[PDB]
Design a binder for these strands. Structure first.
Ligand SMILES: Nc1ccn([C@@H]2O[C@H](COP(=O)(O)OP(=O)(O)OP(=O)(O)O)[C@@H](O)[C@H]2O)c(=O)n1
Ligand SMILES: [Ca+2]
Ligand SMILES: [Ca+2]
Ligand SMILES: [Ca+2]
Length: 1085
DNA sequence: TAACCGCGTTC
DNA sequence: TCTGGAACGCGGTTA
């Protein structure tokens, strides 16, 4: 009813009251009936402020509310204010016929009498419309409304008329010309922010005309920024519960000033003031508020937020723990957190306020940090991004340390707060607010929304600003068939990966090369052109201004000629990485790839016929058994009591696929059948390049960031990764569900074209050297030391121009075989003149030379290991480590600690055999611990090394009908500590494999490690039940551990990184205590 | 055995 | 409701 506007107006009245309490009274700008000129900004009457936030709202006439957006400002005088803007929400109607739009308009004027406020004829460009490249536009009816509810009230009324679309059959209505509705699902506050070009993070003069952007102001304003971490009482071996657990202490930092509140009914002593300063750039003075009760703690917390009026509250995982814990504690205690500090949970359950953004730094880590999930806890993030190791305390030991050593518990509390404040200010604050200047979202949404949604935001701004009609969101095809088979998956062949060699490759050991002579012949033929290519395209200069071109040319010709006569050679190597820079982006731009450019047979040489690969996974069942399964389901009854037809089409196909899955598993002994079909698609080179240019803009931006190559802050590159996070999702947005611009064809052209390029690079490197590993756009390789390497052109300006022949010899061939000579661009739009030119932004980059690269080998004959290796810089430091369990989250700590200790030893020795002998000494030492059943290890160190931690993605209940060590652990954790420990997601499952039950699967022998920290009577009872050994009396873990399972695991690793690779390099087993697979035993003969 | 799955990584 | 992609290692399951 109209009550929705009453509820929403009552919310807006309490928000206004809270805003005023926090210093955000509404500012109405002074009247001026004079002209608005940007140069007159100081003359126009108004208020100037830095935009920090923005929220949609409902306002009254100053009977139903009017939609608007409050904008929250920080003024130059240190104060603050908010200012509202009113804007009628709207969406469009498209027609089937443009000669009868007025007939359509009349009908809509009557059906939506109680909804419509305005109606207007708008013209927009439709990229799906014929001859739209010659100026043709689509006519639309723009329906406007007072507030957002009346818009949704219209959409509810138009759904009947849309779903329908009687007379004598023997020889139209105004309702049947309504085609679809467009731009109906744009979030209101985004619609306003886009139409008015208003962005958080920019300065404005709020005037009665509008917001006047003040480009003179360069820096951000300085908001009051606050961060806090809460520590609570925790049941031993169990998780905390707001229902029964109190808050020990809240620790927080306002603007570099640290504060700590203690609950004196849980904290055993009044704590005196102290300081925690980890690095001198992170100063932590801390003042303590030793309050007696939790009430006095929650109230001091609330009173302090009201005092400092903070516009940014930062947390670390505060949406899941801190905020809902404080909320529940305050509700138990009669406090209403909303009336206190204006904070409350929203639909997604996160905690937000109107006057203040809540910045959970965990959301930044997960999305934009480019950190492995095994390093996304606060401890790791602090080390990698802040540069110190913070205070640590066993969570099993926080609750009792409240009484025994209170100061120690407090030292941990401040540590969490100091890390969170400075992590926010040095990383999340600059990136999020700067991203708000280009993305029409408030800080809360810019921090949390998926990168795919950030891309749609950027693309919608371009579409609106070129008057391009938005496409509706993609609707997923519920069912699709191939050759009569139900497809369970449609996809494209993506990156090309190749393991080519394993073993140890090091700059101080010679390698055997066989140099194709025909390869050097070609390289000599293309050398002159490719050499001009380096100065004029790679370096953007002129061969005439060079002074050493022929010198360098002759020097390169010699090294190649020698390697032509002297083909077979045994010399020291050149370890190199070669990668295409912004590869997938540049491939799309070079080829002018955008979803609206992919078209089928149409009148529309703007061909760009490009190839992609289609892979389909279909049920082996034919359509006839599909119908049988359907009819069988129809004869069945489903719950909500519901016939199969009463169900939604999607739900029906879920059922059909499930029963079809079981039928194929029996009758066909399979579930899916894969078939790869090569396909071709047309890419028009004259389409509106709004998508292509949006990617081009962000790519050129990241080039600048990377161009900040320093040889004192490197955080510049800490943001180039940010541009990459957006660019990568620009390639993925085309396959995203619910996308407005979708084309599998475009994503497949990008992948297949990239594979073609990387295989061309490999095809020549193999004829000139030895390629080691290849993945998507990169190639790890070793080249002879006598191959032409680095050269500097001498310019008449005294300038020096880099030249890596190995790179430019490939770049020239790329620009010779993959250049788009069909790129067309609008020269003069007034008379529609298009001009064609050749475009190729695809370039390779080089890394190295590197001291050492270690590549592991498979346990299966012939196969290699992909996406895993270790590289070392010439100074001994670790350059790259990829794939190994050391980095991965939750692996057997023994393998992680063995790998950390083993890789650095691959640098010692003066021969390939001596390297393996030194690395084997470390292997035998680890084997000694496992064969010593941990005799020289403390029981604590042994559990740490022998425990494997796994994170259950979902809840145990959703894993029904499935067996896993994580499931068995979580089930056994429930039987011992209650069903409450298995309620939240992300359950970390720490377990140990037991020897008994003998002859039993590993999954049935996963004992949770928390049982060994339990009471001695509780220990035996559950161990007995889990070993199936009633006689059990000994409980030393050394007696229960299946030392053989752990020895086989250590052995598998030794075989893949050392023994089997050594055999492929000719060396004999360097760890005979680890025996070779039988196939390798046979090969030695 | 061959086919498949969950997790967490490299692109 | 909100929601970028595919290729790959490893240790387990099932029938
Ligand atoms: N999280 C990621 C990382 C990479 N890619 C894809 O992998 C391609 C190549 O990977 P990479 O070389 O890491 O990306 P580039 O953009 O080429 O970056 P760089 O300049 O470092 O080579 C990217 O273009 C992108 O399409 C992706 O889709 N998602
Ligand atoms: Ca904490
Ligand atoms: Ca790349
Ligand atoms: Ca790179």
């Amino acid at each position: 009813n109209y009550a929705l506007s009453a509820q929403q107006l009552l919310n807006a009245s309490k928000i206004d009251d809270i805003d005023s309490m926090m210093g955000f009274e509404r500012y109405v700008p002074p009247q001026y009936n004079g002209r608005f000129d940007a140069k007159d900004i100081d003359q126009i009457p108004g208020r100037v402020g830095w935009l920090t936030n923005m929220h949609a709202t409902l306002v009254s006439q100053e009977n139903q509310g009017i939609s608007g957006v409050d904008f929250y400002f920080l003024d130059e005088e240190g104060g603050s204010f908010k200012s509202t803007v009113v804007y009628d929400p709207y969406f469009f109607i498209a027609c089937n016929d443009e000669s009868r739009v007025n007939d359509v308009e009349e009908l809509v004027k009557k059906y939506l009498e109680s909804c419509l406020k305005s109606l207007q004829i708008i013209r927009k460009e439709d990229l799906t419309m014929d001859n739209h490249l010659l100026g043709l536009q689509k006519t639309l009816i723009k329906l406007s409304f007072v507030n957002s509810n009346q818009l949704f009230e219209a959409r509810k009324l138009l759904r009947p008329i849309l779903q329908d679309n009687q007379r004598n059959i023997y020889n139209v209505d105004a309702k049947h010309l309504i085609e679809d509705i467009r731009e109906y699902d744009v979030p209101y506050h985004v619609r306003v922010s886009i139409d008015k070009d208003i962005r958080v993070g920019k300065w404005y003069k709020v005037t009665q005309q509008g917001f006047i952007e003040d480009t003179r102001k360069i820096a951000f304003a300085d908001p009051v920024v606050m961060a806090f971490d809460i520590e609570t009482t925790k049941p031993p071996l169990k998780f905390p519960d707001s229902a029964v657990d109190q808050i020990m202490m809240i620790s927080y930092m306002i603007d570099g000033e640290g504060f700590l509140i203690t609950n004196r009914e849980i904290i055993s002593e009044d704590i005196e003031d102290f300081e925690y300063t980890p690095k001198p750039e992170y100063p932590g003075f801390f003042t303590i508020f030793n309050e007696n009760d939790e009430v006095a703690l929650l109230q001091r917390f609330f009173e302090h937020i009201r005092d400092v009026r903070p516009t940014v509250i930062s947390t670390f995982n505060g949406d899941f723990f801190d905020w809902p814990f404080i909320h529940n504690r305050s509700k138990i205690h009669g406090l209403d957190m909303f009336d206190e500090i204006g904070f409350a949970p929203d639909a997604e359950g996160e905690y937000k306020s109107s006057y203040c953004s809540h910045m959970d730094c965990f959301r930044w880590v997960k999305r934009d940090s480019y950190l492995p999930q095994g390093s996304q806890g606060l401890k790791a993030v602090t080390q990698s991004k802040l540069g110190y190791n913070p205070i640590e305390l066993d969570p099993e030991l926080m609750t009792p340390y409240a009484f025994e050593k209170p100061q120690h518990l407090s030292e941990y509390s401040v540590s969490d707060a100091v890390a969170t404040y400075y992590l926010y200010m040095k990383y999340v604050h600059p990136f999020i607010f700067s991203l708000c200047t280009i993305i029409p979202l408030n800080p809360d949404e810019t921090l949390r929304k998926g990168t795919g949604t950030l891309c749609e935001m950027l693309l919608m701004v371009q579409a609106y600003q070129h008057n391009i009609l938005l496409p509706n969101k993609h609707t997923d095809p519920i069912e699709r068939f191939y050759d009569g088979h139900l497809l369970e998956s449609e996809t494209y062949v993506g990156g090309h990966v190749e393991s080519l060699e394993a073993g140890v490759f090091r700059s101080d050991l010679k390698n055997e090369f066989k140099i194709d002579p025909s390869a050097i012949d070609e390289l000599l033929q293309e050398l002159p052109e490719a050499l001009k290519f380096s100065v004029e395209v790679e370096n953007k200069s002129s061969v005439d201004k060079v002074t050493n071109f022929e010198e360098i040319k002759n020097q390169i010709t010699q090294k190649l000629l020698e390697l032509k006569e002297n083909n077979i050679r045994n010399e020291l190597p050149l370890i190199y990485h070669v990668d295409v820079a912004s590869g997938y982006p540049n491939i799309m731009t070079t080829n002018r790839l955008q979803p609206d450019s992919i078209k089928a047979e149409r009148d529309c040489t703007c061909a760009r016929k490009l190839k992609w690969a289609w892979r389909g996974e279909f049920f082996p069942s034919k359509m006839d058994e599909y119908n049988m399964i359907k009819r069988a389901l129809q004869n069945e009854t489903f719950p909500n009591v519901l016939t199969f037809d009463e169900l939604s089409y999607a739900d029906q196909v879920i059922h059909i696929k499930k029963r079809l899955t079981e039928y194929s598993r029996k009758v066909y002994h399979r579930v899916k059948v894969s078939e790869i079909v090569e396909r071709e698609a047309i890419v028009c080179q004259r389409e509106n390049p709004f998508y292509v240019d949006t990617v081009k803009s962000f790519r050129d931006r990241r080039y600048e960031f990377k161009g900040l190559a320093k040889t004192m802050i490197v955080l510049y590159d800490s943001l180039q990764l940010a541009h990459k996070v957006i660019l990568n999702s620009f390639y993925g947005y085309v396959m995203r569900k619910g996308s407005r611009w979708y084309s599998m064809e475009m994503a497949g052209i990008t992948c297949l074209t990239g594979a073609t390029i990387i295989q061309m690079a490999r095809a020549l490197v193999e004829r000139v050297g030895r390629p080691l590993e290849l993945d998507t756009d990169g190639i790890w390789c070793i080249l002879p030391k006598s191959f032409p390497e680095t050269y500097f052109f001498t310019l008449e300006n005294g300038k020096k121009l880099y030249l890596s022949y190995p790179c430019s010899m490939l770049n020239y061939r790329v620009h010779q075989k993959f250049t788009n000579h069909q790129y067309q661009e609008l020269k003069d739009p007034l008379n529609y003149i298009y001009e064609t030119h050749s475009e190729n932004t695809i370039f390779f980059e080089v890394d190295g030379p590197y001291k050492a690269m270690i590549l592991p080998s498979s346990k299966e004959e012939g196969k290699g290991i992909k996406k895993r290796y270790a590289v070392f810089n010439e100074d001994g430091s670790l350059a790259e480590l990829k794939g190994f369990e050391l980095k991965r989250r939750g692996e057997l700590q023994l393998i992680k600690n063995f790998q950390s200790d083993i890789f650095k030893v691959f640098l010692e020795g003066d021969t390939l055999e001596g390297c393996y002998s030194a690395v084997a000494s470390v292997c035998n030492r680890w084997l000694d611990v496992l064969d010593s059943h941990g005799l020289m290890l403390e029981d604590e160190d042994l559990v740490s090394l022998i425990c494997e931690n796994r994170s259950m993605s979902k809840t145990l209940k959703e894993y029904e009908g499935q067996k896993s060590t994580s499931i068995t652990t979580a089930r056994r954790l429930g039987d011992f500590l209650g069903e409450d420990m298995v309620k939240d997601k992300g359950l970390q499952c720490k377990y140990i494999i037991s020897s008994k039950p003998f002859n039993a699967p590993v999954t049935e022998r996963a004992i949770p490690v928390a049982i060994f920290s339990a009471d001695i009577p509780i220990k035996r009872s559950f161990l007995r039940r889990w070993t199936l050994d009633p006689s059990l009396e000994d409980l030393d873990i050394r007696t229960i551990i299946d030392w053989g399972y752990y020895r086989e695991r250590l052995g598998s690793a030794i075989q893949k990184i050392i023994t089997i690779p050594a055999a492929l390099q000719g060396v004999s087993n360097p760890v005979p205590r680890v025996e070779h697979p039988d196939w390798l035993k046979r090969k030695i003969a």
